[PDB]
Write an enzyme that holds these catalytic residues in place. Structure first.
Site, PDB file in Angstrom:
ATOM      1  CG  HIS B  50      62.875  60.881  -2.975  1.00 22.27           C
ATOM      2  ND1 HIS B  50      62.758  61.296  -4.285  1.00 22.27           N
ATOM      3  CD2 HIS B  50      61.614  60.625  -2.548  1.00 22.27           C
ATOM      4  CE1 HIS B  50      61.483  61.301  -4.631  1.00 22.27           C
ATOM      5  NE2 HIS B  50      60.768  60.893  -3.597  1.00 22.27           N
ATOM      6  CG  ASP B  80      65.037  60.785  -6.971  1.00 22.22           C
ATOM      7  OD1 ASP B  80      65.742  60.676  -5.947  1.00 22.22           O
ATOM      8  OD2 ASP B  80      63.790  60.812  -6.905  1.00 22.22           O
ATOM      9  CB  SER B 140      56.920  60.836  -7.345  1.00 26.79           C
ATOM     10  OG  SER B 140      57.853  60.331  -6.411  1.00 26.79           O
TER      11      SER B 140
END
Lengths: 281, 281, 281
Positions: B50, B80, B140
């Site tokens: 993302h 992801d 992240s």
């Protein structure tokens, strides 16, 4: 490379998932939590009061998978505890420590079983000891365990970084109480009272016609033990009130302010006794 | 006075800040995350899917400061994950462990580089292993590391006290896949499939005209490996469907319920084979 | 079974609850926090700036119970610190470490006393060192301590999993400053300035009529120390501006952009000196 897995391995058999096919009183629901087996022989499980609230059905997924039928032995909203029995075999249990050892700063892990198929663990310390245990481990009705991996608490999520548990000592007191009766009432100055049944009355060489509240257990350093009060006493009379009901002590007491000098007539070894006692804010 | 600095020192060179000067498809933005270098030679960075979503520009601040131009090798929204290459020198890397060792209760630290000028670290344990890793460390696309300070996971913040990471094993599988192709498709029963290019087809002594999906890698204990299925197979035919497309396996499979006995015609060593297989909820 | 209780025991006497019976300036309130005693002899307490904001009354519950009258020595919103004195006996204090030792990954515990009757502790690590300390311990004006249980920070909750503290070094600097004056101004390139009182002026063999800002303390590696600037200097003149006010340095400086080459005329040992200096973003 220290790690908590080593003890966690040991103490996860004795964790159970708990599903409550209940209706909502005059719409269905399915409340679900976790629970812990404290007696493997009598197959006693402990869990949250609010999970089994409105329970039509009560089913316990074991860790090894055995979905099971449970039975509500009893409850205690007063400490959100709740006692259940599952009739079953080959049941494993892990060690119970002693809350009285709990220092703040002591390491704990909160464990559960939110999904029946599985496990779940968080980490923090004993934050504060107010009769709540406070902790920075994330949060229920599951085990809290020390750095020795011993069962020292039971978890109870209420209303952030502030977990909350109930000491296993306090938790053994209500359970064993609930087991032995339709029990756990609690009352004056850290004492536990029950109804003097005829069967009890006479069992203790008394008469069946005889009445009072039965002091079932006086917790040490309680103003009661201070007041001279012990288990097996029969509070015949708090002050002017004839105590012949077990929940009187409470309603009786609750309606009296702190710093007030109270007279409990207890009946011990077949003789009356006033006891100088005192209420505290 | 144990502490995690000692290992943290070691494993922070290999952490990168990542800025994505992207436009938002028919308004500018600048999405920014952290990332980790798994191969220092080929200068391979891993990061979140993302973050590089809608990336017009892709720039990687090193820990030593070297702002850099990155290249999107590939992605994997399915987990992801996202693979990038930066062309560069003197690049340092720290150890990768093995997720298969991960017990719950094991101590971890989540590390990142949210600001390019710097570092950032949190602490918890492996909470649950569902294919997610769950953790009470705060989040992240950064490193997750064990108490030995080894790279065991990659972080992925999604939708509280519940961190979430992806095992480095699973993360090596997609990466190395994405490297070797415009890759990572995933399909039946823990297998990875790719397009049988002519160039592959013939490379394996087959014909260029020949068709199927190419079983690129079968993960152990998968119902596929159970089904008799191995890497280098060419699924010619799931059931009635002629598989000549790689993403058929998926659309094919997805439209079949669990507990259903499926027939994969694979083509191995130049001979057909039915394989007794089974879908699972 | 490692645990933090052992050190926590030691360092909890020196934690105080703090109640601020204040009015809200032209409605009552009672703001309440925690605080820490850094000098037991002079009975110096430190706490948050915002707690004693609008304080009409200032009362400090000791850990042993002694409710007490406190005195606002001074404040520092610039770092939310605030210095108080309580006149009292038999006061215990625990060790202060050195922030300069702080690695990230280092274990800490945040401690407090939110209720005056008691204690409270959380756990995490030094996350980042930006002049903030960042941490995953939950959150104020309390102690932060290392794994050796030494006082290394003071807590300051502002605007999640992100605790924030102020290094005890920085915290000693402002305190000892605030003690010795109506102090703590801060200014150019990590220096501390005060008003050149006549009494100081002459005390340093100067004249009473003489004026400047008094460089009270230059922090090492500051562009000031780099600029040649030391404590006991008297900034007579930043650039064109005659510095005869202590807060000029600031307003003076603030209105000048980064990468600009500045001329501080200091007055040292009775002789002027230009100093080549530089501002930095």
């Amino acid at each position: 490379m220290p790690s908590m897995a080593p003890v966690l391995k040991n103490i996860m058999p004795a964790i159970v998932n708990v599903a409550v096919q209940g209706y909502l009183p005059n719409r269905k629901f399915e409340s679900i939590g976790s629970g812990v087996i404290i007696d493997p022989n009598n197959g006693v499980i402990i869990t949250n009061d609010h999970v089994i609230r409105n329970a039509s059905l009560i089913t316990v997924t074991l860790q090894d998978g055995r979905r099971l039928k449970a039975r509500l032995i009893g409850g205690d909203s007063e400490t959100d505890l709740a006692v259940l029995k599952i009739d079953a075999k080959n049941l494993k249990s892990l060690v119970i420590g002693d809350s009285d050892k709990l220092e703040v700063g002591d390491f704990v892990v909160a464990i559960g079983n939110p999904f029946g198929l599985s496990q779940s663990a968080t980490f923090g310390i004993v934050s504060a000891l107010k009769n709540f245990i406070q902790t920075d481990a994330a949060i229920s009705g599951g085990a809290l365990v020390n750095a020795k991996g011993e069962l020292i608490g039971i978890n109870t999520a209420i209303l952030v970084g502030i977990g909350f548990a109930i000491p296993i000592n306090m938790v053994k007191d209500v359970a064993q109480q609930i087991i032995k009766f339709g029990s756990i009432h609690r009352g004056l100055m850290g004492i536990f009272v029950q109804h003097l049944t005829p069967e009890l009355a006479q069992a203790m060489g008394y008469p069946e016609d005889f009445q009072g509240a039965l002091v079932s257990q006086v917790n040490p350093n309680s103003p009661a033990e201070l007041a001279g009060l012990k288990a097996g006493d029969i509070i015949t009379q708090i002050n002017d009130t004839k105590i012949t009901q077990a929940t009187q002590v409470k309603t009786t007491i609750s309606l009296l302010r702190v710093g007030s000098t109270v007279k409990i007539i207890v009946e011990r070894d077949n003789k009356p006794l006033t006891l100088s006692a005192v209420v505290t804010d």
